[PDB]
């Protein structure tokens, strides 16, 4: 589908509210495999299970290994911009 930009608002006591799979070392993108009900990704409205995360806050995740993506994603705070695509 089309590449989309999505805004998520996270408070500091919360995580993003997603599970991710994949990573460059596995030859698969960083994919959203779960969205937790009531947590920030669900509340933002614009993210879906099956979305590939292409970037977050301008940081490219297309070529990142699984744990690299975990570190980068967990570091983001507050108003967080995602670039995503559903294939």
């Amino acid at each position: 589908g089309p590449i989309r930009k999505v805004l998520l608002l996270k408070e500091d006591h919360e995580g993003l509210g997603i599970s991710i799979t994949g990573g460059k070392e596995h030859g698969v993108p960083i994919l959203i495999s779960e969205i937790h009900p009531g947590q920030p990704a669900d509340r933002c409205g614009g993210l879906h299970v099956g979305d590939a995360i292409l970037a977050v806050n301008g940081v490219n995740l297309r070529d990142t290994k699984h744990k690299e993506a975990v570190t980068i994603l967990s570091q983001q705070r507050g108003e967080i911009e995602f670039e995503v695509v559903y294939v």
Binding site: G15, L16, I18, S19, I20, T21, G22, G23, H26, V28, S33, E34, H66, K67, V70, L73, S74
Partner: peptide, 8 residues
């Protein structure tokens, strides 16, 4: 199963 999942 080959591919890991992390809750974040």
């Amino acid at each position: 199963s080959r591919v890991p999942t992390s809750i974040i």
